[PDB]
Amino acid sequence: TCPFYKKIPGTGFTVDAFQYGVVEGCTAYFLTHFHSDHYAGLSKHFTFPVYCSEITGNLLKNKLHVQEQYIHPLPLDTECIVNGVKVVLLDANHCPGAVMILFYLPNGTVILHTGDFRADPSMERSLLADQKVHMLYLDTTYCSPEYTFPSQQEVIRFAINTAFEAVTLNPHALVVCGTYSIGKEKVFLAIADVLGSKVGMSQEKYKTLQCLNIPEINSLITTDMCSSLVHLLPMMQINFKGLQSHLKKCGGKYNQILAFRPTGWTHSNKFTRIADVIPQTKGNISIYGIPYSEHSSYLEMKRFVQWLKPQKIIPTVNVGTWKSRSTMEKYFREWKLEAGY
Ligand code: NI
């Protein structure tokens, strides 16, 4: 059945609730972003109103073949009325098209649903600054103090510098980046830009990127793999077997692979700095795991919540175990005692 944390009280609305069939009483289904755990259930046969960003709407129409008459895209940072209720969509700093949703209930209650987000101080000067928020439905993915990671800027500097050094030393090296969903596009785009190359990819991935409103995208991506020295492959294929096989297919154009896997967090974060990261190597193949996150670190999450000062927090991630739920509740109490709300 649909969990309580996907239902918005006092309304006919659900959030990211497409895998439960017809949810009784639901008059409008919101979709925060185009990631599969959130869209699961949508297809060309869906016939209820879906509310989302413009980018998410492009992906629904073109990738899932949802009919246009049921897609309701909303502009960002703009007050809109949906089934008699005022809503605002805000940038979530997650993947392209990802939003947080503010709901203004008829009775005076104000609710923020973060979707998936990476909290940033720039959010402290959006439309959030303009009123009190009573209830917060929070992306708690990394809600534990062991989860530190660097800024996105520091991780990109590392990737650019590593790729540029490798290809300048060996002009016959190929760079490969893994992907399995939208998000983390800066990794492969920034490397291609430093090397003066387009990024080569499958037709399916090219289609996906053409839906994202990225400026000058025709200038950065291509389906002509032969003309490119940065290739995108499925994340599954970023291992020694899969990369050896890919190198065979390039027909002696290249003699080395430098590959990147842009994972969220991996335990080496606890004891290491970004400057100190090293690859796994076998023969003429090296693989770097880089901690590029599109979710809040523990400290970023803490700062956001202590700034917002909500009356009630409802976690949306790690809710399946009593130990996880107890742990998160202890942190929320700490944060409230420190800040004084
Ligand atoms: Ni996501």
Swiss-Prot record:
Residues of the full protein shown: 700 to 1040 of 1040
Subcellular location: Nucleus
Family the UniProt entry places it in: Belongs to the DNA repair metallo-beta-lactamase (DRMBL) family.
Subunit-structure text: Binds constitutively to TP53BP1. Binds CDC27, which is itself a component of the anaphase promoting complex (APC). Binds PIAS1.
Protein origin, superkingdom: Eukaryota
Task performed by this protein: May be required for DNA interstrand cross-link repair. Also required for checkpoint mediated cell cycle arrest in early prophase in response to mitotic spindle poisons. Possesses beta-lactamase activity, catalyzing the hydrolysis of penicillin G and nitrocefin. Exhibits no activity towards other beta-lactam antibiotic classes including cephalosporins (cefotaxime) and carbapenems (imipenem).
Tissue specificity field: Expressed in brain, heart, kidney, liver, pancreas, placenta and skeletal muscle.
Induction: During mitosis. The mRNA encoding this protein contains an internal ribosome entry site (IRES) in its 5'-UTR. This 5'-UTR generally suppresses translation while specifically promoting expression during mitosis, when cap-dependent translation may be impaired.
Protein name: DNA cross-link repair 1A protein
